[PDB]
Amino acid sequence: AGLVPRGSHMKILVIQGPNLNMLGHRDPRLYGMVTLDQIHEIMQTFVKQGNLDVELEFFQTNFEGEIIDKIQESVGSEYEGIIINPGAFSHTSIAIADAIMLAGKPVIEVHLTNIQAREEFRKNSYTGAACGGVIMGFGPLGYNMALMAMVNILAEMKAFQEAQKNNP
Amino acid sequence: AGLVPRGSHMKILVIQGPNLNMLGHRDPRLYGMVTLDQIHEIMQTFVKQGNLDVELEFFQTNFEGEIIDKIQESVGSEYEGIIINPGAFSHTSIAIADAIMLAGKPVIEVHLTNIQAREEFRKNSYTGAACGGVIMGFGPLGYNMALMAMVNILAEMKAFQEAQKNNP
Ligand SMILES: O=c1c2ccccc2oc2ccc(S(=O)(=O)N=c3[nH]nn[nH]3)cc12
Ligand SMILES: O=c1c2ccccc2oc2ccc(S(=O)(=O)N=c3[nH]nn[nH]3)cc12
């Protein structure tokens, strides 16, 4: 008793789906040539500026199967929550949505654009329905909003579980 | 020149739509009896904790027309941005969506629940499509996320407009 110091390395996995790696090379003039690496740096700076004890891991892929593999690799292993932008797969991938459903951890969906405001085929998100919450239309800023939420959620889950939940 | 001290009273209007006033009296056991007034207090505390120079005004109504009147009253007058939860009107009110479209200021939509994860009739948001961005499924926390975003947006709009934009 009293032998386990606190508190948190929170470990959050950020999964980016198809085409996002081309940000700032084709577009966005919409955010003035911000790149995907730059969004990731922005998230790291958010952590630093808040003096938060958070470890971020970043992963981008154009493959549905690589997204599912990555979600599965997190289930047994260390990552406490996932921030995901499945991009265009959000509207079609029942398989990714099911993988999220049974990930056993909080998952937050982010989109750069307001997918509710575009073509009819972009309005549906199977994956969004599986996630706890969805953020859309804030550009890179949306990712910092997702991080703010995830830190709150993971900090409160600990409080409950331990100290309270249990003092072995 | 140099005769106008800076910087910000940001004035943000928070508009809550139908049934939300009954939070914590019928539900949410979903958030343990949090009331609508309590959400508003949470937002005020967010401002205080960040030492932000932000003024919040709160308004709840069960009337579509009162929401439109309130949006209009902001156009000519002082409020720099709107955070809105139109609730069940989101799925049906073209009129509120049009009022948002021409509000001439940033408008962010928030829902407590993940409306993408419920009945088919709740998935559509006319109002969400009109807003710059949408946040759903974070409970009260979503409102603090909306505030974080709005402060960023309004701070950057000033930088541009003034100093840069213009030094009369
Ligand atoms: O805006 C972009 C974008 C711009 C330049 C080059 C590549 C790009 O890839 C993207 C991928 C996803 C998104 S997204 O707005 O984050 N998600 C979407 N879901 N369905 N459609 N969009 C925006 C984008
Ligand atoms: O969860 C509630 C709620 C619980 C107890 C009593 C009244 C309530 O009113 C609400 C009003 C709106 C929402 S809402 O999830 O923020 N927005 C919705 N749009 N369409 N359906 N829901 C949740 C709610």
From Swiss-Prot, chains A, B:
Indicate the annotated site residue(s) for Transition state stabilizer. R26
* Active site per the UniProt annotation: Y31 (proton acceptor), H111 (proton donor)
Q: What superkingdom does the record give? A: Bacteria
One GO molecular-function annotation for this sequence?
3-dehydroquinate dehydratase activity
EC number(s) given by UniProt: 4.2.1.10
Pathway recorded for this protein: Metabolic intermediate biosynthesis; chorismate biosynthesis; chorismate from D-erythrose 4-phosphate and phosphoenolpyruvate: step 3/7
Which chemical reaction does it catalyze?
3-dehydroquinate = 3-dehydroshikimate + H2O
Which major enzyme category is it?
lyase
Family assignment?
Belongs to the type-II 3-dehydroquinase family.
Q: What is the recorded name of this protein?
A: 3-dehydroquinate dehydratase
Task: Say which species the protein is native to.
Answer: Helicobacter pylori (strain ATCC 700392 / 26695)
